[PDB]
Amino acid sequence: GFRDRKVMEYENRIRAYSTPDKIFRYFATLVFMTPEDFVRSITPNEADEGSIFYTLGECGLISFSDYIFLTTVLSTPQRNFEIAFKMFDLNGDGEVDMEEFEQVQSIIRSQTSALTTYFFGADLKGKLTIKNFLEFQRKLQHDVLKLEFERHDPVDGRITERQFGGMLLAYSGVQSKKLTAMQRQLKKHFKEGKGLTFQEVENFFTFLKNINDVDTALSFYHMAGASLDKVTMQQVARTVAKVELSDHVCDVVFALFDCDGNGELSNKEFVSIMKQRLMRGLFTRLMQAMWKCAQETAWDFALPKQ
Template identity: 30%
Template sequence: MGSRGPISKLRLSTFLGRGGQQPSSLPPPVSRMEMLSSSSRGFMFALTGFLGGSGFIYYLINPERMKMRQLQTIGGEQEERKRILSPREKRFIKFSSVELNGQIFMTPQDFLDSVVESEPKPRIKRRKLTLDEVYRETHQTLQLKDDFQNIGSKGLISYSEYLFLLTILIKPTSGFRIAFSMLDHDGNEKIDKVITYRTRHTCFLERREVEGDSKEDDFLQKDIPVDTTILVHFFGKKGDRELRFEDFTLFMESLQTEVLHMEFGEFSKGAGSISELDFARILLRYTDYETILNRLYERLEEEKGISFEEFKDFCQFLNNLEDFQIAMRMYTLADKAITQEEFSRAVYICTGKQLSSHIVQTVFQIFDDDGDGLLSYQEFVAIMKDRIHRGLKSYAR
């Protein structure tokens, strides 16, 4: 088979000769380089040599700069890998101020800062603690009624507990029972420390099995047997106390109220109310709100102010936003805009609370695009989801 090519060519030429046809007299194909004049070809070769030689000479003269570019490329690849982290992971890493055996932790104050501030407080580096130091700090934690601000930096919050606390902040009162039941394995209305440890250890093993041992963010969560602030809060300093549903509900309600007080106090400066513009700033903190604020300023005839109770009632309504969506879909099958009366009625059905007429009017002044007195509830819901998730998820279009 290897010598068949030349024989076939000979036979083909013989065959063509028999037919009275002459072999082709066309010249062989010419490359573009060969079509150039000798001077042009010389210039192309010179240019190629110049570019190649210049790169080599540049490396000899500036080896550090070449290495720097390589490092920048590597750094860019590492930066791409960092982007794999979720917004929650990035925020936990940014605000965590304590490290124990290679794992980072938040303090209770870190957690509060992470949900009301855009940047953490200035620090040189994280505090590195030993197990003995952690024991002394966490066991200074007092009772369930004590808020996180009083505990301050004396305590630890792991990444999994951080996610748990974020969930608490957006849970409606009706969701407290569901959250408790997920931990109450035997249904006796009580949770002990052993069950909590076992659940946390199981979740850790499942995560390692799914993600593998080479995961670069293992510093977020390791299987370190340490009493965190939440565990001491729930089960006491000796770990022999059982957590009842009533205590669990008290903790969740207290944490929600504490965060709302911090947000409200940022603008009230000790006063009993905040302005309507400041109320809008809190709601729109995680969106581009300058246009909306300007529109609200033009519509406000006088400043009456928003009390903390009004602010709290509205924020607790936001925790029932999914129920509100269902109610609106059932009521307005064509997704049409709604009136203030329809809005107030839907809120009451979802929460059992009646919002003040002033705060409902303020909400409509904020979100009513064309001033027709109606509210596009879909846009309202999208922006408010950004609010309740504190920018860690994006819904607004």
């Protein structure tokens, strides 16, 4: 199907760019939102009884401000999220009242019955603490990751290496049109491989999410022309992200990304991509692209020293 193909391409494109109001208006009922529609809007090219989305489904339709808050809780890392919470709390005591939360959520109302029942009681009184806040953070992130995992049809509770590589390359919204060839080659490169159990990809995704600190943690490798390595990646993931990584996952990431290199995975190869994609918070599809391409080409050409 060609027409449905271009429809899904345009939906994915409007998902990638111009998110805040255009997406929320693009998915609705009949001005509010529904949880399954939210899940549809957060997944590209596309009732629970145990999920968070079930709890919201029991609750009333989601608001636009709630949508913004959900985007931020999905986006920001853990430490920055703790800082954001500390900024949420206006009063001294470490508990966000319903009134101050209402103020800092109404501050987003620019185009001029919420998730409160999950944070507060039906009386809209029960104030929460930082512990419940981080618990909701972790629960929502693990839940969306579980949903994405199960969307890829698993075998024996496991996922082909090509599928994991495709999910990874889809996480960083970069269309190199050449890394897809590496994704395709990963299958034969890992002929009759393992199944990449959910815990391995979970650990790798939490590590990738906590990369803003990983970058500054290995800053000595930068400023020295150094390049990454298997053991060093193991170490930095164990120290900063505080989680283990199986050697197979590091192997498949190396095989996916270290294309120009010979197994070293320098800054421009892997870390820069994720560090830039984590900062998404800041025919027309030809001008800017061609300009950037030409700029890079001219820079590479002029790269002939003094």
